[PDB]
Amino acid sequence: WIRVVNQSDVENVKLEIDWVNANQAANYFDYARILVTGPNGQVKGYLSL
Amino acid sequence: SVTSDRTYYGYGDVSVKNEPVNVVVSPFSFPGANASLSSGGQGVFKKPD
Ligand SMILES: [Ca+2]
Ligand SMILES: [Ca+2]
Numbered sequence: 703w704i705r706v707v708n709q710s711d712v713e714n715v716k717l718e719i720d721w722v723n724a725n726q727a728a729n730y731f732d733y734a735r736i737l738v739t740g741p742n743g744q745v746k747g748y749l750s751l
Numbered sequence: 752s753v754t755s756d757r758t759y760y761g762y763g764d765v766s767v768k769n770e771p772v773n774v775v776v777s778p779f780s781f782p783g784a785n786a787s788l789s790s791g792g793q794g795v796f797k798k799p800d
Contacts, residue, residue: 708789
């Protein structure tokens with residue numbers, strides 16, 4: 703879904719993922735849980751309403 | 752019959768031509784070649800000469 707492509711020098715990256723229209727989807731969903739399946743099996747992110 | 756004015760001379764010259772040093776510059780283009788510098792990146796760059 704999101705492919706992070708780095709240049710030949712960058713080695714350490716800290717990404718802040720943020721859900722902006724969650725207050726709108728609150729009117730449509732009752733529970734929604736997004737797990738960002740990270741690099742090689744790790745799951746480093748979890749977003750909800 | 753002559754009253755000699757007793758004064759003979761010797762002379763010499765000193766030649767100061769150059770300035771003591773030549774600071775030959777070979778400037779550095781540090782992103783270099785076959786490398787990459789990215790925004791926010793951290794590292795080291797080396798130029799031997
Ligand atoms: Ca000179
Ligand atoms: Ca770096």
